[PDB]
Amino acid sequence: AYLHHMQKGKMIQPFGCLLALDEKTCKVIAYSENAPEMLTMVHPALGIGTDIKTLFTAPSASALQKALGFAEVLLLNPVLIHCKTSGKPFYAIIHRVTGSMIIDFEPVKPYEVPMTAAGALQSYKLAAKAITRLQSLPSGSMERLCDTMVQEVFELTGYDRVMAYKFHEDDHGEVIAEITKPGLEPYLGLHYPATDIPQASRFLFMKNKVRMIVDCHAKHVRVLQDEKLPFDLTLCGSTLRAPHSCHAQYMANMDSIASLVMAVVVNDNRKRLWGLVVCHNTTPRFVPFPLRYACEFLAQVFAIHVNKEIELHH
């Protein structure tokens, strides 16, 4: 049941909006219900069949159309687009599922637009400096390694709590490293049942390496697809995918209103989800795609060092 509903990904978070385009026509075959309000100023309305040249400025529309010609692995994200009518800017984060191109749109502040390259370099520079400090660490201690990683992620991301959450051989988890703002209740050293993080969630982390939830109380937005399609599209690769209601309740229950989670995959391309780097915030929190992208590489390097320490232990 979990996997069915998570793969389809028909509910999104309202911080952004989603379009899916047919690779052959470049026209809209799915949209989140908030996309008309976000991307247009409601003389044709955004719906099934819409041409993106009516939605975005010419260079923006062209950048999205040109993306159709890249293999997933060669897509360079994000694209900064401007809406045609309003001029409103968004980062467009593109992924592919077979013959569909799925696009997440996350708003950008106006003053961020001239600074887009600057901010991207700075985010990656900070992450690269973290990586050099991971590398500097004396080997032999998983604990020092994980302590360092949670400290670096805390400084980079500005969340109230950062944990290293390790999966044991029976799939139960343990918090093995933690940093928090002063005053928060610690979870360090605590163990949690396997069923707190279902198989389906662990499976998706193998492919979707960074997952952000801005506000667990936010009202989810439905995605509508072309009625002509005789199957459901798979939208689980979206950056905006809404949390399952069980998990949103779980978050509300522990006063983690926002989260950012990074998969830690050892022997990645023996390939195994070692654990998660789990960031929580007491209040809503959004971090822009370039920083999340930089975090993904920091987590990849961490995973290499984790596996080194495992082998040094064995």
Q: Which residues bind a second copy (CB under 8 A)?
A: 59-60, 62-63, 66, 76-81, 91, 110-111, 113-125, 127-128, 131-132, 135, 290, 293-294, 297, 301, 304
286 near ligand CYC (CB under 6 A):
no
244 near ligand CYC (CB under 6 A):
yes
Instruction: Name the residue among 240, 231, 5, 195 with its Cα closest to residue 105.
Output: 240
Given the rule CB under 6 A, which of 18-26, 103-111, 135-143, 192-200 is the region that contacts ligand CYC? 192-200
Task: List the structure tokens of 79.
Answer: 């694209």
Nearest-angstrom CA–CA distance, 35 and 20: 11
Residue type at position 288: P
Position among 22, 23, 33, 196 found at the interface with ligand CYC (CB under 6 A)? 196
275 near ligand CYC (CB under 6 A):
no
211 contacts 260 by C-beta, under 8 angstroms: yes
Q: Which is nearer to a second copy, 79 or 221 (CB)?
A: 79
User: Which of ligand CYC, a second copy, none lies near 202, with the C-beta cut-off 5 to 8 A by kind?
Assistant: none
Q: Which is nearer to a second copy, 10 or 292 (CB)?
A: 292
80 contacts 292 by C-beta, under 8 angstroms: no
Nearest-angstrom CA–CA distance, 249 and 255: 10
Report strand pairing: 173-180 vs 28-32.
Answer: unpaired
237 contacts 208 by C-beta, under 8 angstroms: yes
Given the rule CB under 6 A, which of 73-81, 145-153, 188-196, 220-228 is the region that contacts ligand CYC? 188-196
User: Which of ligand CYC, a second copy, none lies near 54, with the C-beta cut-off 5 to 8 A by kind?
Assistant: none
Task: List the structure tokens of 243.
Answer: 């949390």
Nearest-angstrom CA–CA distance, 82 and 91: 9
273 near ligand CYC (CB under 6 A):
no
**How open is the CA angle 38-43-46, to the nearest 5 degrees?**
35
User: Which of ligand CYC, a second copy, none lies near 206, with the C-beta cut-off 5 to 8 A by kind?
Assistant: none
**CB neighbourhood size of 132 (10 A):** 9
Query: Closest approach of Cβ 72 to a second copy, in Å?
Result: 14
278 near ligand CYC (CB under 6 A):
yes
User: Which of a second copy, ligand CYC, none lies near 16, with the C-beta cut-off 5 to 8 A by kind?
Assistant: none
201 near ligand CYC (CB under 6 A):
yes
Q: Which is nearer to a second copy, 132 or 195 (CB)?
A: 132
Query: Closest approach of Cβ 212 to a second copy, in Å?
Result: 17
Position among 261, 277, 294, 303 found at the interface with ligand CYC (CB under 6 A)? 261
Residues near ligand CYC (CB under 6 A), total: 21
Judge whether 246 is annotated as a binding position.
yes
- The length of the chain is 314
Question: Tokens 């805390």 belong to which residue?
Answer: 154
Nearest-angstrom CA–CA distance, 151 and 302: 13
Query: Closest approach of Cβ 210 to a second copy, in Å?
Result: 14
Nearest-angstrom CA–CA distance, 261 and 207: 13
264 contacts 296 by C-beta, under 8 angstroms: no
For 27, which DSSP code? B
- Which residues define the annotated binding site for phytochromobilin? 246
Residues binding ligand CYC (CB under 6 A): 2, 6, 173, 187, 192, 195-198, 201, 211, 213, 243-244, 246-247, 250, 259, 261, 276, 278
